[PDB]
């Protein structure tokens, strides 16, 4: 159905997995991957499993068929791909946190690309066994900015830590980005 | 279904949203986005929800999938996108007003491209939350023109401000642009 | 359906309009644009309106959607496009007559491309609002040719008016250039 | 359906008409073009007429849409195109005969390509209604050959004028061409 | 259906004929061309003949459409193309046999291009009415490779013969080439 | 249906066979290949056989059409292709082992890509009839790493050979890669 999914070439596994899961959810098949295996399986379950396996095999590049050649269901294929490409290791978290704690904003880059990079790093941390909530994301985003945003950083941190959301902080930062680009 | 929609890469959100809304209306699915949530859900409503969510996910770039990563409906995805990209802000509208006031037609550019740029700026300013009347758009268009159009700028302002539509002014400006190009 | 209709980008509006109308007629949707609005609208009429609007939006560039941005029917979109791009402006007619009269053939040119250029100029001129019959088209085409064609030009202008058509004249000119190219 | 059909740009009209007729016959729609118009029209006839007209418009270049701008059926479009193009002017027949009378075999061209070109010329001339006997075709083919085939020319002329066929002459010419290429 | 069939332009007629016959067998139409004229004014027979003619015409280039312009059955069209491009002539067969016997192999081209040339020569002999079996093909192939392949040529020729194919020999020769390239 | 299948040209036969089998299963046609032939054949079985043969032929290159020239079914084509290109021979697997020995890790390549290449080679070797135990896979993986992994290799070797799996070794090597890339 959806043909905007680039075949898995070993790069950007999160995006491919998300698009495959969305496409499966379109066809009322995502219950196979997530839902528990019923004690008795009927024709509908078999058809759903066949459709999920066919879709996953179709959206895998030629070199990656070996993840599906064996007699393994779609959920097993996704589990194997997740284990190979999204592994929960403390070393990965420790390596990624140092990059996240040293991610300054370059002058030539706008806050939209910087926000995209920061969100990519946060999602990569969350892929491993990390527990980062909204407040930690806000704190990292605030500490990953140059000195021109000191006023908004001081003002935002004074706000109560119960209604703060990442979108609100991002909008407040973009407003001062617009203000700052005028004063430089 | 319709592959003329450019994936949303953070630029020209109004066009992308309009195209997505039109595509959803074609499939008889737009009732998810705008129609009220029924008290009792059925198979048709769930199918429409899934189809709308899958279409929106299909027509988003790889960077913007975090708007749909959460288990939320297509209506909520569009609401979040509206709040993050079509929010009403005063600083942004002030910057757009400055850009409109500092907009000058270049010699190389033709009046059609200048009109397109002016309409884009007006649409962005209106989305930013600045109410603009037709006469304000007409005055901006008149003052954003070079000295070659001074005669027609003076002539147009003398007309009564009761049926002066932007289309008539644009047509007259094109007609005199033909004469201006004839004399160069 | 058909992808042979190039998206509208401000050039060759008549061809795009005709192809869009033909595509709408193929899907039995042209009654929306041409047929009178019924007093009571049913599911079929609104479905046809949605299909026409989606088709026109799909075959419009991202810069030309400002007309359709307002929630208005496709018939009004076509009417606005016609008013903007097919307007009875005398200055455009005069400029296109001046360009058409001074349209001498170049040495490095193919007469099929010359016919294409002449026909697009004529189509633009008719869009400008100046009616040109057949005889004027043949006269302009004949006067646009060099002196090497004088024999066939005189033979054609000596022929009867009833048998004189633009396509027949173009065929005669092709037959003559075959000899001209052979005789070199 | 068939994408092998080249859009009609004013050249080789017979090929385009044959391809379009075959495509229409594929969809069981050619009955509209060829069959008599029924006194009472139904939904099927209207759908077939719409499909035929839409296909003809789709497989027409931008320079020939004027043949379908008027509100006419596909039958009338094909009739007008036949009237304009399915007629051989005196100059066309004279040019065909001149090409036949001045046809020669080049060094780089093989005998298969030359035979194909000669057969194409004969087919085009017969399309104009010029009856040609087999001996005339044989004489034309023999005089269009170089001087390297004089031996087989002398051999062929000595055969009785009762069993001379074009196929036998072509086979003998190819057999001699094999030796001629060997004798170099 | 099958679009891998390239349009016939007087090149590699055997491949095109095989693909066309396979496509006709897909639609159960081969009875029209291979049957002993079981004509009994059947509607199914007429439909099959029309479908065969349409399929043959679709996969023919514009140059070669003169082979099917007349009202001849698909069997007659295939027979005419066979008589034109598969001519049983002993002189051509002898010349091609000389070409095979004096083939050898170059110093720069890989085994794949040499195999393609050998396949072209063998197919042209089979077109020329020469009866060649698998063993004859292997014997012709194995006398053209350089002395670097003698170690595998002797081993292949020493085998028990019986059930060995040209494809297996080609695979072994490609493996030997892979082993050779590491040294030379 | 799916045109993503590269036509077979003697390279990567397993991928081509898997894609062809998947496509046949999609069309409800694969039952002719795996399922037993019924004693009495009906029209449905004949249609499925025709579809399978035509689909296999369509995705065979012009060089490999000789595998289906004779009157054979899809099963015969697939079994002949298996016998020629999927046979379990010493020569088939010795080359694969010699390629595994020379799979040195490059500096620009991450261990994810190198692990994928090693897995592809191991799967190809398994398809070559050479059964490989887990420890052999681990040793083959370990001998392809540079001197930067000496410590982890020694630690792995000192481990007991009871529950040492390839996944555990790969995870340890990836953690060591993180540590190494940190130390540069």
Residue numbers in the entry:
A (entry chain B), B (entry chain D), C (entry chain C), D (entry chain F), E (entry chain A), F (entry chain E): 3 to 186
Give passages from the manuscript.
Here, we show that the Ty1 retrotransposon Copia forms virus-like capsids in vivo and transfers between cells. Copia is enriched at the Drosophila neuromuscular junction (NMJ) and transported across synapses, and disrupting its expression promotes both synapse development and structural synaptic plasticity. Because Copia behaves in a viral-like manner, we used cryogenic-electron microscopy (cryo-EM) to determine the high-resolution structure of the Copia capsid and found that it is distinct from the related dArc1 capsid, with a larger internal capacity and the presence of pores similar to those used by retroviruses to carry out their reverse transcriptase activity. The capsid layer is composed of the Copiagag protein’s CA region, which contains 2 alpha-helical domains.
To enhance the resolution of the capsid region, we used local reconstruction methods to determine the structures of individual subregions of capsid known as capsomers, which are sub-assemblies that are found at the vertices or faces of the icosahedron. Because the Copia capsid adopts T = 9 geometry, there are 2 different hexameric capsomers along the faces (a hexamer with local 3-fold symmetry and a non-symmetric hexamer) and local refinement of each hexamer provided high-resolution maps (overall resolution of the non-symmetric and 3-fold symmetric hexamers are ~3.5-Å and 3.4-Å overall resolution, respectively). The high-quality maps of the locally refined capsomers allowed us to build an atomic model of the Copiagag protein with high confidence and good stereochemistry. The NTDs form central spokes at the center of each capsomer sub-assembly, while the CTD is arranged in the capsomer periphery. (D) CopiaGag non-symmetric hexamer is colored by electrostatic potential. The positively charged (blue) pore is at the center of the hexamer. In place of the spikes, the Copia capsid contains positively charged pores at the center of each hexameric or pentameric sub-assembly, similar to HIV. The positively charged pores of HIV function as gates for dNTP entry into the capsid for fueling reverse transcriptase activity. We hypothesize that the pores in the Copia capsid play a similar role.
